[PDB]
Ligand binder design. Structure first.
Ligand SMILES: O=C(O)CCC(F)(F)C(=O)O
Ligand SMILES: O=C(O)CCC(F)(F)C(=O)O
Lengths: 198, 197
């Protein structure tokens, strides 16, 4: 049962793909790193997500191309692939529960595709916030608080935008009183409202 | 073994999620459908893909929220979910094979995410085209031919764009001779060179 301070790396592009991971607490960011140094987020994982699944494919004989980072402080479990395959026999039920975990991962990615598919960057941002409310939301007076410190830069890397654009967009939303920000945590008021339009 | 003609629906949003599917031949399009009929593609599936995985979470208890369409003529297998659980819990390693297929679905989707992250539509297009080269490509003398009829509208629905914009971009790519198109089949000339970028 391993822990990771916020922003520490769990695995680097190029590392052998030998382990599978289960997220216990916190959020994990998976990203692609381009030669220049720019990261694009491909996933923001919530608690109880299986990940590192490249290792279930070619296993130990192929390398990570994503970077996994503890987006908040993290606790997780991990095992080398050969150990996981075995525990599957000794438990043809664990097997079924993994299948459900991976199915959930698939559905979550598709939902981020929907988010990125919007032409209007504003709606893209609203749609991303809604996913976050679902994944990291905590109920409160004014609606739902996304329980993560979110920099504008981080939002930008997740919705294919730039810091500058995100700042402008978060501000348009605050003016309209549709969200609040305290210590970098976003509160979305009337979330079920916003769900309208898809 | 079932077959579906090109453009036939395999399942509609709101249909109970009762089966899991395995695509043997052809391409299947998963899309989100909006009140007025526009559709957004969330996946173009290639041969040998498990799909319909919502029913592994919930079986027929909940409903589909994506539209599954035969993007080309299609041949597939499908089984109700309890028949699957038995097949698995009764077949230990068949289960390791599913685990792998779902793993592959996850990585394919993440690549569509990388494709959509680009801010420049030209690059979304090229990047989408290169994925299609890997998924449905047939090699030939002038590079790789995407063995799919791809209308401009279908491309637009997959990369978050309008048709007019796709047409223009495809126009650019031909003028620059990075692709040619013949009868909706796109050939990418020197894809490995385009990959770098
Ligand atoms: O397994 C990889 O190497 C990256 C992590 C993942 F993208 F595969 C994931 O499980 O989503
Ligand atoms: O099962 C769904 O409802 C649609 C198809 C799928 F998203 F589930 C899939 O397996 O990608």
């Amino acid at each position: 049962v391993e822990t990771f301070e916020r922003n520490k790396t769990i695995f680097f592009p190029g590392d052998p793909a030998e382990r599978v991971y289960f997220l216990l607490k916190g959020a994990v960011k998976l990203s692609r790193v381009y030669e220049a140094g720019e990261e694009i987020t491909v996933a923001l994982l919530r608690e109880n997500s299986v990940f590192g699944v490249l290792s279930l494919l070619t296993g130990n004989k192929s390398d990570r191309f994503y970077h996994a980072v503890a987006f908040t402080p993290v606790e997780l479990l991990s095992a080398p692939i050969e150990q996981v395959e075995q525990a599957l026999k000794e438990n043809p039920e664990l097997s079924m529960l993994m299948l459900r975990g991976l199915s959930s991962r698939i559905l979550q990615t598709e939902m981020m595709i929907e988010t990125l598919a919007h032409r209007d960057m504003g709606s893209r941002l609203v749609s991303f916030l809604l996913i976050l409310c679902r994944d990291f939301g905590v109920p409160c007076a004014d609606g739902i608080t996304i329980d993560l410190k979110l920099s504008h830069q981080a939002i930008a890397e997740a919705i294919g935008s730039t810091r500058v654009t995100v700042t402008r967009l978060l501000g348009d939303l605050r003016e309209k009183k549709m969200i609040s920000i305290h210590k970098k945590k976003i509160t979305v008021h009337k979330p079920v409202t916003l769900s309208r339009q898809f």
